[PDB]
């Protein structure tokens, strides 16, 4: 069967609560986002299954997620009622100080496991922009 | 019952109305997302009622709200079929100039009445950034 | 007939495809959010029909739009199952350096041709702190 509308609005809400989770620095609902052996890839590596994906949460928050608002725009989601891939952008901004911090391109394969959806891979490709690749 | 696509994409177009409306000086528009019994909570406190809710629209505009762009990302509903929340970003920046002017996380509870959503609370929690917070 | 979720979720898609499509300089899949007959208005002008909107594309690039992330944002649509219009907020950063760019609001006149949405005139009111203006 076919991607419903309310499979949509919850591949986005995987984004969201990826990224409000990680500005809050809520490890357990940024893991809820993940299946059991989901991924996250950056320039940095990746990350893989639930014990990986903690301690990389801490590493990102460490070396340049924290103290930030990570925004998704421009999903386009494409699939069926089970697996899907979404496409979306990632603008990073400070909540300290009126500066930005980073964009990027987001690419995730999503999957419907006992009735809910998962991020199973997601590959965030960062813009030269970031002072960590600087 | 529980929320419908169509539910959760209306309840995420009043912020949208919101917010447009502030930028635009559309007072009328601004006060229509507001159930009568509506009220919008921020650091400078919480206005409640539409007599409260349009002197405090004028009172943003005066003395920061005015001349900027604000933007709504990455929206988290929860609810039934006739009462919901959403947990959402606010990103501010400036239309006259490149600068940014400031960033929120907000809270909204949403009504149905009559077949159509409403505000009754808008909590913003503005990020430290704000120049009048400074 | 009203419009379904799934429609409206195929408009705001034709403004992440534009956008997305722009910030790739996929010239292709920018296209393909068009109707045959449809134009893109700004302060530059207007560009109708598919090769316009082509030299159109590339035109924007060369200026202004090349390097950049293009956003959407607070997407409003009101219509009924074949025509609808959409009104949203486009800003604009800078991919190579932490710069804002722009920021615009954006009307769009959309139609269902063969059960699949197409732009038929985007019109984008650019704010004035664009370096080009
Ligand atoms: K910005």
Known sequence: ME???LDKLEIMELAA?????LDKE???????TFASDGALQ?????????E??????????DTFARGKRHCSSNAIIQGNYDEATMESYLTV??????????SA???DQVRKINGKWYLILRQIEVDPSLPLLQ
């Open 3 to 5: 991607l419903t509308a």
């Open 42 to 50: 950056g320039f940095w590596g990746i990350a893989k299954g639930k």
């Open 26 to 32: 809520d490890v357990e609902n940024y893991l809820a």
């Open 105 to 107: 391109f987001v690419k």
């Open 52 to 61: 990986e994906l903690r301690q990389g949460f801490y590493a990102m928050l």
């Open 93 to 102: 901004v400070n909540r300290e100080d009126l500066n930005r911090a980073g």
């Open 17 to 21: 609560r990826f990224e409000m989770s």
